[PDB]
Amino acid sequence: NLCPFGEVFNATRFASVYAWNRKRISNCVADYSVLYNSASFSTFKCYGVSPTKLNDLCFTNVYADSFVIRGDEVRQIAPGQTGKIADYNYKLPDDFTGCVIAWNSNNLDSKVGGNYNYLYRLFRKSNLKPFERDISTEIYQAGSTPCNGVEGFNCYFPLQSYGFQPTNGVGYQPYRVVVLSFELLHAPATVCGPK
Amino acid sequence: DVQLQESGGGLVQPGGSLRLSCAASGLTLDYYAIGWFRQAPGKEREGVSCISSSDGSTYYADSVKGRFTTSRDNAKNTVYLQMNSLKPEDTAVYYCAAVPSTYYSGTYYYTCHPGGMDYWGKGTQVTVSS
Ligand SMILES: *[C@@H]1O[C@H](CO)[C@@H](O)[C@H](O)[C@H]1NC(C)=O
């Protein structure tokens, strides 16, 4: 029947970007009219696909990826970009066929004096390859000095909280993000437009 | 709405001492960290000291150890750096920064990252010569 996207966009609570969530939509019909005629969204950047032509199309599988970041960082939910998120938490390929959406969530994800439940990963030995996901808490050895325990400026915790406060500024206020990825394979196309 | 003013710094000679000072504004945070950073000429930014807000816990960069120390007077919301046996390579523009602490699973960690702090300040200059 209807493809379950309201369970993805209307989730009571989302996840941290380093631990990003993927939900696969399959064998169903969807009107994206909920999505694109909306006006409640900050970010609506589509790649390889007109979002207005989505109901006239069929795909083999659809992947809804959801997470939370700041607004200064959405730019990074984009093809071919760099920085803390793109390089170490969530990567989009240059060959992205899909759409990316976000909106302010300062009313759901912030707390007076800091909401710490949202974390991003500060560093990795290498850059995350497309669609990769990393949840490791391995003490990061900055100083190239043997690391045991956890110590100082030379051994570091790789994750950082966002400390969301409602009184923060918009680029520092919370944004829920949904990456909708649309795939055509050499097999049957279940996920289609209403018409 | 967090503002920070670093104060202190001048020409000091070798073996010398100076004491720096951050000014803290708007922290409304419950668990935070304040860092001292420095950027020498033509080199990258480096961290000198971190203090936790909960207990005042502190860490230091290796070379800085034994000489520089960090304290807090909660009242003026100021954080300091007692610089004490100055050397020429300690010449730099020194910096304040603020950061949220991180609470993974109720295990508290505080990280002062030159790559990653939320709030920063203009800077203070410390020169060490004869
Ligand atoms: C989320 O719930 C709202 C209710 O305000 C609804 O209007 C919207 O269509 C839902 N989002 C979906 C189905 O993507």
Residue numbers in the entry:
A (entry chain A): 334 to 528
B (entry chain B): 1 to 52, 52A, 53 to 82, 82A, 82B, 82C, 83 to 100, 100A, ...
From the paper:
We previously reported on the isolation and biophysical characterization of a SARS-CoV-2 RBD binding nanobody, NIH-CoVnb-112, which possesses robust biophysical properties and binds to RBD with a low nanomolar affinity. The Camelidae family, which includes dromedaries, camels, llamas, and alpacas, possess a subclass of immunoglobulins that consist of paired heavy chains with antigen-binding variable domains. These single-domain monovalent antigen-binding domains, also known as nanobodies, are ~12 to 15 kDa in size yet still exhibit potent affinity to target antigens. The structure of NIH-CoVnb-112 bound to SARS-CoV-2 RBD reveals a large contact surface area overlapping the angiotensin converting enzyme 2 (ACE2) binding site, which is largely unencumbered by the common RBD mutations. Here, we report on the molecular basis for the observed broad in vitro neutralization capability of NIH-CoVnb-112 against variant SARS-CoV-2 pseudoviruses.
To elucidate the broad-spectrum reactivity of NIH-CoVnb-112 against the circulating SARS-CoV-2 variants and to map its epitope, we determined its crystal structure bound to the prototype SARS-CoV-2 RBD at 2.82 Å resolution. NIH-CoVnb-112 binds to the RBD through a canonical site of vulnerability that significantly overlaps the ACE2 binding site. Over 70% of the contact surface is mediated through residues within the elongated tyrosine-rich complementarity-determining region 3 (CDR3) that forms an extensive shape-complementarity interaction with the receptor-binding motif (RBM, residues 403–505) of the RBD. The CDR3 loop traverses the amphiphilic groove flanked by the protruding RBD tip (residues 470–492) and the RBD-core, which is stabilized by an atypical inter-CDR disulfide (C50CDR2–C100HCDR3, as defined using Kabat numbering). The 21 amino acid length CDR3 contains six conserved tyrosines; of these, three pairs of π- π interactions appear to be crucial for the CDR3 loop conformation, including the face-to-face stacking of F490RBD and Y100Enb112 and the two face-to-edge contacts between Y449RBD-Y99nb112 and Y505RBD-Y102nb112, as documented by their high buried surface area (BSA) values. Outside of the CDR3ʹs extensive contact region, the extended CDR2 hairpin also helps stabilize the RBD tip (residues 481–487). Of note, the side chain of F486RBD stacks against the backbone of the CDR2 hairpin and fills the cavity formed by the inter-connected CDR2 and CDR3 loops. There are six additional hydrogen bonds formed between the RBD and nanobody residues outside of CDR3, including nanobody framework residue T28 to Q498RBD, CDR1 residues D30 and Y31 to G445RBD and Y449RBD, and the side chains of CDR2 residues Y58 and D61 to Y489RBD and N487RBD.
